[PDB]
């Protein structure tokens, strides 16, 4: 079983020896029965076959490598492309084809060249100080791959791989100056699940229902915005941005500032997880309004479940009610056992808020510190996190700052 021998595979020795020679890091992704590990020093992927030896791996080389550091790697919805995400750029790698009885890339050659294409290359060279804050794929598994980029200019741009230098859609959310509104800028976003929406939502007609995905956008000051995206029917310049979503109930501390991460759990009504650098996790029910609102069902303080570090949120492939949190102290698992009690009809009127409040007094989420990376001297964040989905029990892979491969359970 790979859960036993994977921590001893030579790829981790290779990566570890590469150390001796900001975005949160995730240098690993899984596909099929294979694990992909980004080797920054060689600008290539190390591919280990988990299903079907400690020295065997394939190296997937970038024909044209990125010169900026890769912080995160992200497999596309159709699983034919990988986004190579850095602070100073984004590059998309096309995976090669497989063949042979073992379904190895290009028949099991030790080394395979992969085509790459830079994205939005103009914006990162023209404006030297322009940085990438967050990136993800448009969730569709049917359309051409589209990447979604949030840059430090507080603008979101969508690019087709067919025209990687020209946005298909722009979302203006609205440093030379001294400013007090330093937190009125987006730090992250996340797509919600597929939804059918009236075509009238995008200005067209027919009373017909079209595919769209809700896009939730998080400001540093904790404010949240919402817009629905349809690559076919959305305008080139999207202006129907809803928010800031009112956050209920009123909190004495106004839910603070310094929000750093957002996650939309795949449920209806949508539920947002908002994380802060201080370790606060807010679980927010999105209540339909035309502006929806948020009901903070509960809050979790990770500082108590063990703190001024960036927090990264991960969905669970099996259960919409569970997610995971990675930080300098390790990994927390959070189970929202109350998700299944919320019905699809919920609304934003007063009686619904009172029912949610009453329900929150008899329901609590389950939080567990499953992996501890705390040192003996300076704590270091993990470099990789992946949940291998097996129906017989999810296996979690966590790559430490020194490229140790921790496996849980």
């Amino acid at each position: 079983l790979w859960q036993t021998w994977l921590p001893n595979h030579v790829v981790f020795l290779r990566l570890r020896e590469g150390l001796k020679n900001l975005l949160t890091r995730n240098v690993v992704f899984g596909l099929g029965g294979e694990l992909f590990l980004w080797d920054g020093e060689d600008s290539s992927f190390l591919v280990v076959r988990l299903r079907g030896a400690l020295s065997q791996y394939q190296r997937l080389l970038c024909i044209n490598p990125p010169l900026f550091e890769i912080y995160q790697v992200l497999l596309s919805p159709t699983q034919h492309h990988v986004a190579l995400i850095g602070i100073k750029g984004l590059m998309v790698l096309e995976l090669p084809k497989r063949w042979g009885k073992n379904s190895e890339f290009e028949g099991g050659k030790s080394t395979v060249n992969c085509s790459t294409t830079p994205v939005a290359e103009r914006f990162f060279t023209s404006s030297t100080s322009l940085t990438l804050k967050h990136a993800a794929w448009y969730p569709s598994e049917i359309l051409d791959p589209h990447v979604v980029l949030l840059t430090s200019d507080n603008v979101i741009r969508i690019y087709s791989l067919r025209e990687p230098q020209t946005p298909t859609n722009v979302i203006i959310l609205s440093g030379r100056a001294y400013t007090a509104s330093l937190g009125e800028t987006a730090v992250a976003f996340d797509f919600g699940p597929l939804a059918a929406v009236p075509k009238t939502l995008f200005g067209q007609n027919g009373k017909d229902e079209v595919v769209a995905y809700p896009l939730y956008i998080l400001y540093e000051n904790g404010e949240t915005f919402l817009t629905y995206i349809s690559l076919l029917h959305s305008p080139g310049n999207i202006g129907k941005l809803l928010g800031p979503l009112p956050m209920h109930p009123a909190a004495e501390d106004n839910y603070g500032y310094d929000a750093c991460a957002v996650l939309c759990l795949p449920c209806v009504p949508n539920i947002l997880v908002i994380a802060t650098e201080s370790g606060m996790l807010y679980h927010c029910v999105v209540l339909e309004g035309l502006i929806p609102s948020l009901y903070v069902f509960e809050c979790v303080e990770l500082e108590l479940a063990l703190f001024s570090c960036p927090v990264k949120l991960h969905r669970d492939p099996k259960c919409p009610s569970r997610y995971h949190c990675t930080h300098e102290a390790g990994v927390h698992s959070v189970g929202l056992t109350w998700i299944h009690k919320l019905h699809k009809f919920l609304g934003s009127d007063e009686e619904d808020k009172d029912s949610l409040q009453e329900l929150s007094t008899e329901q609590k989420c389950f939080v567990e510190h499953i992996l501890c990376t705390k040192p003996l001297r300076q704590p270091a964040p993990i470099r990789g996190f992946w949940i291998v989905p097996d129906i017989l029990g999810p296996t979690m892979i966590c790559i430490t700052s020194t490229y140790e491969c921790l496996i849980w359970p």
Partner: protein, 150 residues
Amino acid sequence: MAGIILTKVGYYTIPSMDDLAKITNEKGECIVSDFTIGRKGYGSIYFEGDVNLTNLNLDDIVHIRRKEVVVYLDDNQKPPVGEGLNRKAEVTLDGVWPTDKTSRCLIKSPDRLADINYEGRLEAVSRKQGAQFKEYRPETGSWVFKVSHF
């Protein structure tokens, strides 16, 4: 006027533009100590010590907005540190209040601002930009902070 240009509505100087004219000497040089330039209702910039305002286009150099201020629009047309208006200064921005995430109203109550320690938030917002927080006045939302230069 002997050199200085300031015409944008709402802007002013202490001493006034008229006073600066009379301060100009025989050879046409306007040197003043503790000079202030402000925009009524939005903020002001206090320059302690002597500064040479001779032939400065304050309309093009100084920009005061709500919760924001700019001095010299681009770095190329900026003098070195210590010369011109690119020097130590005390900035005051008015109408600086946080927004209630529930009601979406501005929080102006001193007790409410002490509850959420908005003062400590402004101290952090100052350091992150290379400034030193000095004080905050709730009644007018006046955020005062010192900068080493612009």
